[PDB]
Amino acid sequence: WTNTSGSCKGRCFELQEVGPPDCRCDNLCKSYSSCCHDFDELCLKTARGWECTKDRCGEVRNEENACHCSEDCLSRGDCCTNYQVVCKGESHWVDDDCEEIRVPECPAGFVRPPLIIFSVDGFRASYMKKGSKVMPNIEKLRSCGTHAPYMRPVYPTKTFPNLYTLATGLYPESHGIVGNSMYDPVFDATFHLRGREKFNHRWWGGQPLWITATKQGVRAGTFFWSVSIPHERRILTILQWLSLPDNERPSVYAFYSEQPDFSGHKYGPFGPEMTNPLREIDKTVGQLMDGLKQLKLHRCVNVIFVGDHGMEDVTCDRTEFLSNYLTNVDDITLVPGTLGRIRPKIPNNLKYDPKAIIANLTCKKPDQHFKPYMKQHLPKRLHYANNRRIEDLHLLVERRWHVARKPLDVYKKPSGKCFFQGDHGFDNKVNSMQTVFVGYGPTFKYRTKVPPFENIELYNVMCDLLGLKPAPNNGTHGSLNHLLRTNTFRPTLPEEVSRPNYPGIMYLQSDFDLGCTCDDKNKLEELNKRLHTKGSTEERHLLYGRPAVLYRTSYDILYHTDFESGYSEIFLMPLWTSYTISKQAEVSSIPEHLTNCVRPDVRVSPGFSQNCLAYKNDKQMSYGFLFPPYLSSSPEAKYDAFLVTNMVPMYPAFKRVWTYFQRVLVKKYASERNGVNVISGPIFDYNYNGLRDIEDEIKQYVEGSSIPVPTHYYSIITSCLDFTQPADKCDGPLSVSSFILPHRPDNDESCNSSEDESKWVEELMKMHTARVRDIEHLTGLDFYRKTSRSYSEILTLKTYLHTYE
Numbered sequence: 001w002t003n004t005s006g007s008c009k010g011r012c013f014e015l016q017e018v019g020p021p022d023c024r025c026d027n028l029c030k031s032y033s034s035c036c037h038d039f040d041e042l043c044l045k046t047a048r049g050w051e052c053t054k055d056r057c058g059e060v061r062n063e064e065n066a067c068h069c070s071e072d073c074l075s076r077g078d079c080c081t082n083y084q085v086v087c088k089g090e091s092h093w094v095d096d097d098c099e100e101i102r103v104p105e106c107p108a109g110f111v112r113p114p115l116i117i118f119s120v121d122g123f124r125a126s127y128m129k130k131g132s133k134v135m136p137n138i139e140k141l142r143s144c145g146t147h148a149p150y151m152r153p154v155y156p157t158k159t160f161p162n163l164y165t166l167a168t169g170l171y172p173e174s175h176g177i178v179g180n181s182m183y184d185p186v187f188d189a190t191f192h193l194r195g196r197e198k199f200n201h202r203w204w205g206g207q208p209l210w211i212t213a214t215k216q217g218v219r220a221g222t223f224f225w226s227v228s229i230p231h232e233r234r235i236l237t238i239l240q241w242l243s244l245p246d247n248e249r250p251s252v253y254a255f256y257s258e259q260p261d262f263s264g265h266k267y268g269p270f271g272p273e274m275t276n277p278l279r280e281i282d283k284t285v286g287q288l289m290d291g292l293k294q295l296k297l298h299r300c301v302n303v304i305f306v307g308d309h310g311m312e313d314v315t316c317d318r319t320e321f322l323s324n325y326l327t328n329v330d331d332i333t334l335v336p337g338t339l340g341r342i343r344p345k346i347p348n349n350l351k352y353d354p355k356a357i358i359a360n361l362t363c364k365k366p367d368q369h370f371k372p373y374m375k376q377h378l379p380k381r382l383h384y385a386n387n388r389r390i391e392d393l394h395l396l397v398e399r400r401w402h403v404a405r406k407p408l409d410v411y412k413k414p415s416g417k418c419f420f421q422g423d424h425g426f427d428n429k430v431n432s433m434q435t436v437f438v439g440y441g442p443t444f445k446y447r448t449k450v451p452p453f454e455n456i457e458l459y460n461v462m463c464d465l466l467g468l469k470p471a472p473n474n475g476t477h478g479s480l481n482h483l484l485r486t487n488t489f490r491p492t493l494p495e496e497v498s499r500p501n502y503p504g505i506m507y508l509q510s511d512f513d514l515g516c517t518c519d520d521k522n523k524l525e526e527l528n529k530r531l532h533t534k535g536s537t538e539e540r541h542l543l544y545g546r547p548a549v550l551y552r553t554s555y556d557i558l559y560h561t562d563f564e565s566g567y568s569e570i571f572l573m574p575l576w577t578s579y580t581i582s583k584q585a586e587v588s589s590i591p592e593h594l595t596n597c598v599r600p601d602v603r604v605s606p607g608f609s610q611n612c613l614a615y616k617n618d619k620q621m622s623y624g625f626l627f628p629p630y631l632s633s634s635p636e637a638k639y640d641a642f643l644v645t646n647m648v649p650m651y652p653a654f655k656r657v658w659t660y661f662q663r664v665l666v667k668k669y670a671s672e673r674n675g676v677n678v679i680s681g682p683i684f685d686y687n688y689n690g691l692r693d694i695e696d697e698i699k700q701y702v703e704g705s706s707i708p709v710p711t712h713y714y715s716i717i718t719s720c721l722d723f724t725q726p727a728d729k730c731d732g733p734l735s736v737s738s739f740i741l742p743h744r745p746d747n748d749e750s751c752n753s754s755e756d757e758s759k760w761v762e763e764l765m766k767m768h769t770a771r772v773r774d775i776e777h778l779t780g781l782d783f784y785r786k787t788s789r790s791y792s793e794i795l796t797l798k799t800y801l802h803t804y805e
């Protein structure tokens, strides 16, 4: 219980931690119904508005006013933000020319540049195009400071998961806020935007910036504002805080704006009605900057202007209804809209039949505007599976569409129209969902554009800007060093844990009883005394050094004319297979007599090899090769491609994808990019946590054997950023794209897979694009260790995501 009888006198927006039975006066008390009885009259003053007027200059101080224009206001930090402009002939910050801030210029008493995070809800990246015509203050931050053309949010692209991601550097599956609404089957409770439940700390995991700061003895302003506090008051409060005594003043502040999200929902992202909301946000920014200038802090503070997600054209007319697919939608609960999450309406209902539901939801309309996934089958880049609050059954919705349970849930007006024309929440690589980032201040670079990056990266950077050590998170610390003038983070290469063996030719064909047969032989190669020696293999095919193995295991480096690989004696297959394909490379066939050819590898003991018998006996599982016979450099070299040490288990369904990739796409990449270097390999993620499985976690083997089946196959395709130089002779920055393809028994994901592979395989691969960094997590390997670039540049490269938008 809170004793509301107390008073907020001399306590307004106090940074003091106060709890029951004492009443509060902080910027969140209203949200807790714990404000002292006079909080509003003493703390939310509104008299005379938010701006000084000529007739107010030098006034007698009336403590009833919202903000002051009296002579003493400056030293009290009470002035309306335009005080000096109206009353002292100064210029608005926005009218001042941009000037490089080479070192912080702070009043005495400031030991470090404060950080102010200015978050705008639903600010689509492309809104920035509206330029100084609409947002002159924001355009000055953007053009003069450091900006990205856009920033990638996390899925789902809604506000709660994104704001907490920004605060923690964690994926939603790790921090717990996996949606604006969610049900936790252990709590048996439902979290909603509206309601008290969300205030319960049990929902919020990880360690958000304000906690990290506090634990390390750095003072944080309040990172939450009750909706009833007008933005002008929030700004005045931050400026008031900044004027506090040296020993009370916070180092980090957060402003939040609910716009332009709401206007976007109402009017759509391209409505003429969006201009007004944008003007208002810009005005608020101008208040902050004017205020800062008044305080002599405009060349002292670092400011981050950042959005949580974008906004797409979505209207009532574009709603799919589950009732068109399912017989009883009244027995399920659906988290709806721009994503779908499905569970039984009655928790734990025994009659719930997810296999039958998914079957009815799979490719049943030719223009179907969503796709069902068991969560473990969602593209790995989304990192949306490892949490009990994430339903097993998910619907990825097509941009511009909604999914609903039944037409009852949709409310057309007499106009046949809906009240909303905008929404968001879709796949985070969708263009419309991209949001904004600008950094401005002494620690950021001047007039610099940086490539787009993910919002999970910012937590490390804000820690850097505040001299803090970040809690464990999903950012890659250093990948954003290029945004900063100073306070960069010097990364260190992870230490290799397992050294490879380099087995020579040791066994005889006679030693092998694996059930493998090859109808032909290359007897010439038996005469090559230096067969499979290093030679020039590593320098042609392993361009960026061997991947470091970062866990305890036993593996062999194997050399070949056309490829090199790191063969695991434990998983019975390569951890990685690396090869270079030149722009002019020739594609050839697998000779008919070699169709079913598999050859024992005399470098590796029979006990550490797969056996073809398992494959012959398993009527569902077939096999493929990591280095493709199609790209052999000669008929003689092609024999290497059929070694049992190049073989991996693949469902025929998957082989349709993989063969198209091996035979058609790699060459196409080489042709388009002036040669490519390829590293491919297996991934084991049976418990869908985005991390390499230990042996105990692998749950499927080839029939009758201990050959483990990968849940995915990866490929990393590198070339020279400067496409005029061949991949193998590159002098500068690299260009990379990667994939993590799901290894599945069918192609149900691909509604057109009945057609030729040229009609559907690439579409599938684009959906499963990935960062090299994703693959590192899933494999425990570390790539690009030997290059001519800085470690920081490599880190950036590893976080790159080729989105194909």
Ligand SMILES: *[C@@H]1O[C@H](CO)[C@@H](O[C@@H]2O[C@H](CO)[C@@H](O[C@@H]3O[C@H](CO[C@H]4O[C@H](CO)[C@@H](O)[C@H](O[C@H]5O[C@H](CO)[C@@H](O)[C@H](O)[C@@H]5O[C@H]5O[C@H](CO)[C@@H](O)[C@H](O)[C@@H]5O)[C@@H]4O)[C@@H](O)[C@H](O)[C@@H]3O)[C@H](O)[C@H]2NC(C)=O)[C@H](O)[C@H]1NC(C)=O
Residues within 6 Å of the ligand: 170, 171, 173, 174, 175, 176, 202, 203, 204, 205, 206, 383, 386, 387, 388, 472, 473, 474, 689, 690, 691, 777
């Ligand atoms: C993204 O980055 C994060 C952070 O580094 C990585 O997540 C970490 O993964 C490691 C390795 O598996 C886990 O280590 C295990 O930790 C457990 C117990 O740890 C407890 O205490 C820690 C530290 O105080 C705390 O962070 C953990 O919090 C989890 O559980 C809370 C209560 O349920 C929950 O509120 C919170 O959201 C978080 O849940 C998430 O993680 C758990 C697994 O712990 C998972 O089941 C859940 O679905 C969420 O994903 C926890 O109380 C030890 O017993 C083990 O021995 C082991 O050391 C870390 O716990 C985990 N940290 C966090 C915050 O998630 C991700 O792997 C990385 N992702 C990728 C793809 O790289």
Ligand SMILES: *[C@@H]1O[C@H](CO)[C@@H](O[C@@H]2O[C@H](CO)[C@@H](O)[C@H](O)[C@H]2NC(C)=O)[C@H](O)[C@H]1NC(C)=O
Residues within 6 Å of the ligand: 003, 004, 005, 006, 007
């Ligand atoms: C709730 O708050 C009010 C105001 O703080 C408390 O009223 C005071 O009670 C003390 C103790 O009897 C008196 O000496 C003061 O005169 C009261 N203050 C005023 C301004 O009237 C009240 O006691 C609190 N209720 C509790 C403690 O449960």
Ligand SMILES: *[C@@H]1O[C@H](CO)[C@@H](O[C@@H]2O[C@H](CO)[C@@H](O)[C@H](O)[C@H]2NC(C)=O)[C@H](O)[C@H]1NC(C)=O
Residues within 6 Å of the ligand: 325, 326, 327, 328, 353, 356, 357, 360
């Ligand atoms: C999947 O869709 C089929 C229709 O294609 C549904 O089949 C109906 O089944 C009910 C009994 O469950 C029958 O009375 C109807 O005659 C069937 N419809 C038709 C037109 O064949 C089936 O119910 C759906 N299953 C789920 C899980 O929703």
Ligand SMILES: [Ca+2]
Residues within 6 Å of the ligand: 684, 685, 686, 687, 688, 689, 690, 691, 692, 693, 694, 697
């Ligand atoms: Ca795993």
Ligand SMILES: [K+]
Residues within 6 Å of the ligand: 615, 616, 617, 618, 619, 620, 621, 622
């Ligand atoms: K088979």
Ligand code: NA
Residues within 6 Å of the ligand: 747, 748, 749, 750, 751, 752, 753, 754
């Ligand atoms: Na299909």
Ligand SMILES: [Zn+2]
Residues within 6 Å of the ligand: 122, 261, 262, 265, 424
């Ligand atoms: Zn919204």
